[PDB]
Amino acid sequence: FNILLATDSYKVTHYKQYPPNTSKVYSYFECREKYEETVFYGLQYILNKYLKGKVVTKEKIQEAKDVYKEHFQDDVFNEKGWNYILEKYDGHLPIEIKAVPEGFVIPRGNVLFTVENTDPECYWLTNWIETILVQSWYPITVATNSREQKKILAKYLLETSGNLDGLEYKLHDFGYRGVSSQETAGIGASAHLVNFKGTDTVAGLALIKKYYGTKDPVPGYSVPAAEHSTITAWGKDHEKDAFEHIVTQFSSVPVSVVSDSYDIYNACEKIWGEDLRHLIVSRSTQAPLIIRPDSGNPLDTVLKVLEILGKKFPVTENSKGYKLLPPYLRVIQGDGVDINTLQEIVEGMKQKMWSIENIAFGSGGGLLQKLTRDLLNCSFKCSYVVTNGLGINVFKDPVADPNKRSKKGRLSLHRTPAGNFVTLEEGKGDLEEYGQDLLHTVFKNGKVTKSYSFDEIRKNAQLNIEL
Amino acid sequence: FNILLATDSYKVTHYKQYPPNTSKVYSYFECREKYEETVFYGLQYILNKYLKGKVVTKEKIQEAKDVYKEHFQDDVFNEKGWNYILEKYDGHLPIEIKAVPEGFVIPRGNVLFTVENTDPECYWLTNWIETILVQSWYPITVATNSREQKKILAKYLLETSGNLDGLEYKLHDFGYRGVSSQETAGIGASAHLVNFKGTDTVAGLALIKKYYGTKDPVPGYSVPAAEHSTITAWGKDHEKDAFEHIVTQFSSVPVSVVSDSYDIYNACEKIWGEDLRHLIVSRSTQAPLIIRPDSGNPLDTVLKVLEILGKKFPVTENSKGYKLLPPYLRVIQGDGVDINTLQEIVEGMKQKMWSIENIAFGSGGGLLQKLTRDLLNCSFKCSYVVTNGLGINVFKDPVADPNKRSKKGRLSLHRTPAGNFVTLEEGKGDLEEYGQDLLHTVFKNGKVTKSYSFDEIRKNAQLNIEL
Numbered sequence A, B: 001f002n003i004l005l006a007t008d009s010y011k012v013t014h015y016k017q018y019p020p021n022t023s024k025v026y027s028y029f030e031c032r033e034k035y036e037e038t039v040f041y042g043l044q045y046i047l048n049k050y051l052k053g054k055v056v057t058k059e060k061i062q063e064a065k066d067v068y069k070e071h072f073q074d075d076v077f078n079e080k081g082w083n084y085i086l087e088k089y090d091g092h093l094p095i096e097i098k099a100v101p102e103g104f105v106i107p108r109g110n111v112l113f114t115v116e117n118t119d120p121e122c123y124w125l126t127n128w129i130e131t132i133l134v135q136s137w138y139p140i141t142v143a144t145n146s147r148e149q150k151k152i153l154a155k156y157l158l159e160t161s162g163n164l165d166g167l168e169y170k171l172h173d174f175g176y177r178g179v180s181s182q183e184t185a186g187i188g189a190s191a192h193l194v195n196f197k198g199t200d201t202v203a204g205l206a207l208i209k210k211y212y213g214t215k216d217p218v219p220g221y222s223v224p225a226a227e228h229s230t231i232t233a234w235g236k237d238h239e240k241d242a243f244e245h246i247v248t249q250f251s252s253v254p255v256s257v258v259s260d261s262y263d264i265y266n267a268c269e270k271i272w273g274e275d276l277r278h279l280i281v282s283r284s285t286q287a288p289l290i291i292r293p294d295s296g297n298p299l300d301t302v303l304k305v306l307e308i309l310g311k312k313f314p315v316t317e318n319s320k321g322y323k324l325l326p327p328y329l330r331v332i333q334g335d336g337v338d339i340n341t342l343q344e345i346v347e348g349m350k351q352k353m354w355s356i357e358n359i360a361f362g363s364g365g366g367l368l369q370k371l372t373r374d375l376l377n378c379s380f381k382c383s384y385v386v387t388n389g390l391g392i393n394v395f396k397d398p399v400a401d402p403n404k405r406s407k408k409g410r411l412s413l414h415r416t417p418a419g420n421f422v423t424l425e426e427g428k429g430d431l432e433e434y435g436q437d438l439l440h441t442v443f444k445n446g447k448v449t450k451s452y453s454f455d456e457i458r459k460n461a462q463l464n465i466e467l
């Protein structure tokens, strides 16, 4: 990896565009003003993997110089300025980054981190690294969207069952194949694990161990489960034999069995319902069969599967008046799930008097891929510069869009007297009217100065209903 | 990178699930049946970076064993199967992959690649690597959606100007900050460069040189350009000074200057139009000023910018009857651009008699992030197995969704008598009624066996209008 080749191409040219005698460029990131509050997560990964230590070498400078000469068909690369960092700082970036603690849940429109150069010669460096830092939008957005789904699950589980038992296993990550790269898979899976413990995206485990850390051996867990190949390989007329083999191989742990290869309704009513019923009603409460539909309208299919199972298996009514399958039998809907369809399904279940205890959800592309930087309006902008020794507040205020207006001056984040948050502009945090700045230095002059464990991040990101 | 920890968690338990004495599992990838045709691109990256050579070691087996013991809370990992590959094949995968040539443009619902194990003990390995291989959906989808935008641009450039000059520079990649990882940025940028030569996502250059290669030193190009920080740092009252400094700095090369920091209309009509007009009109055809709006309704902003500039600069009428700014002045719309708004903008310009020669487009999130595996229904499924020495044709036919039905048996890709594509099922390619199979072996037993340069991929992906 070469940080000199890790920026948008136009930035290579920006050192020539800043006002002359500029000794400092100070910029900030926010999720501009439902997604009212966002989980701040993922900067520590970027700091450690890409920004810390000796990130400039003579070879990296020469390689960048050669690439940019061809890419621009002109010599515009700031070799002198990069060689300065190499010679003066042993290739360590003279940048200070201050950030809200990871896991913190912050309302939209607040400063989440700031970046500035610590050596006047490196005024151009602050926004060189915008591109790599702005990619924090992704773990922020996955963690936030996963937490909003946890909010919906908690509200329906509490109403239907009177408690939150099992909440942290109700949204399982199925997204490994549906994201755009191996690296995205690990980042996204780790962001989902801020909120839940169920994942099949194995890449998230190694990322959390390497850059965050947990007291437990692993941060996420899974169970044996079939796919269409392991059912259909038996031949169409032998679906029952496949189901029998698989539940017998995994008789003492939970096992998920995709049941829609040919006819989900026939499989639940006849194969599970009658032919293999003796192998289901014998199972432990710690080792249920989890029937998995995987096609059709997600709501209609869940409701019809539950209706079928409720007629073939003993059903109890819990203390809130909702129907509950026996403890050896559960359902997972892992097709077509995103935050909108998750809400539709749990509301449809509630209307038909089915407890949310009966169901869990798997989500793949909806959880990790169908998200953009535009969802929370993640943005990085310069708000303060020093030119000719005088600080000036800088901002953008497009006439066409008031929403794109940026903040002015030196920023700080504070608790309000009512316990909310406020971002103070124009250096007003220096007046000390609002208690301590919540931004902490996390990176300075090539060194990670403050780190958080994954357990702390999870604590910071808890729901109020959990609290 | 560990291939043992690079699959969905449920796949680890699969070896147990298949029918006893299964010696072969054969699977295939398609973009299931506007996006009628898809560009096949990106498999060669995956084969080289992740699948070739010695990918199993004793340390990787031990690492996977220890992770999965905690992740499943049980010892379900197939240590013996992985050890077999390490001992018998020096850790090279006994898999054969056949694929259509990269850059080929293939209608939906055709086999694009197939995967099978070459050793009977490794029947479980075919679908182990599903997760890694299915991530090819992303470069396929970026390349396809980029090509569909090229078709729109070509249609409207041809109609408004009579030729396709400049087509390959008309959609520029702005997506580096808006994708979910560094790895995704390189993959996606490379897939856009199958169809265009303009890009700010520098990561794509290194990936193309390393895994595909080009005759030219670099596959893509850029120009100097401003961002809001380099304008707003001068202070709001000094926008004109920033513009004058930047244009002067890059007088002999094309320069893009974002002009919407405060008032885009005021900047075009008063600052560019009157105050700095002398600086603009003196510029060469090879180095025009490119005015860049970045906010408001994209079609409304483009039309109003062009009306303003048409009244301050000398407009001509080209041979098709469309208006043309002088050659030293162009526009780039780099906000809100996606396949749908691109179409809206070029059609609105045509209706207002504005030649598409006047404009280019910058796309970030829409080009590389706002895409999912569901757009082209990219899907990997087992179609053939051998059990007890007998081949059987296998598939999934969900009752609720006919679209999810998968193909049966051994597959092959052919040309029809009219020159179209057909996928033959059930081994029927062997009858030779449709000539030789189109697919080529690209991977066998740990080695890449056939490969394509980026120049060949570009040629294969050309538009008919270009041919």
Ligand SMILES: CSc1ccc(CNC(=O)[C@H]2CCCN(c3ncnc4nn(-c5ccc(C)cc5)cc34)C2)cc1
Pocket: A165, A166, A167, A169, A170, A171, A172, A198, A222, A223, A225, A254, A256, A285, A286, A287, A288, A290, A330, A331, A332, A357, A358, A359, A360, A361, A362
């Ligand atoms: C469908 S609901 C269910 C399922 C399994 C069980 C069997 N173990 C249990 O009960 C204990 C053990 C740990 C998980 N515990 C859960 N408690 C509520 N809900 C859960 N879902 N879940 C899940 C979700 C997705 C996947 C792929 C696998 C598992 C785990 C859930 C509590 C009970 C209820």
Ligand SMILES: CSc1ccc(CNC(=O)[C@H]2CCCN(c3ncnc4nn(-c5ccc(C)cc5)cc34)C2)cc1
Pocket: B165, B166, B167, B169, B170, B171, B172, B198, B222, B223, B225, B254, B256, B285, B286, B287, B288, B290, B330, B331, B332, B357, B358, B359, B360, B361
């Ligand atoms: C807005 S139109 C324009 C722009 C610049 C020029 C100045 N050089 C040129 O003309 C020669 C030089 C190479 C590219 N050539 C192009 N030929 C048609 N169209 C193009 N667009 N384009 C672009 C796309 C994205 C970015 C960030 C910068 C530039 C390059 C375009 C031909 C002329 C017309």
Ligand SMILES: NC(=O)c1cccnc1
Pocket: A173, A174, A175, A176, A200, A225, A226, A256, A334, A362, A364, B008, B009, B010
């Ligand atoms: N475990 C599962 O059922 C699963 C995992 C990944 C993708 N789809 C399904």
Ligand SMILES: NC(=O)c1cccnc1
Pocket: A008, A009, A010, B173, B174, B175, B176, B200, B225, B226, B256, B334, B362, B364
């Ligand atoms: N070159 C540009 O104008 C650019 C690049 C990346 C993102 N936005 C704008």
Ligand SMILES: [Cl-]
Pocket: A056, A057, A058, A059
């Ligand atoms: Cl060095």
Ligand SMILES: [Cl-]
Pocket: A226, A227, A228, A258
């Ligand atoms: Cl599956």
Ligand SMILES: [Cl-]
Pocket: B226, B227, B228, B258
């Ligand atoms: Cl910009």
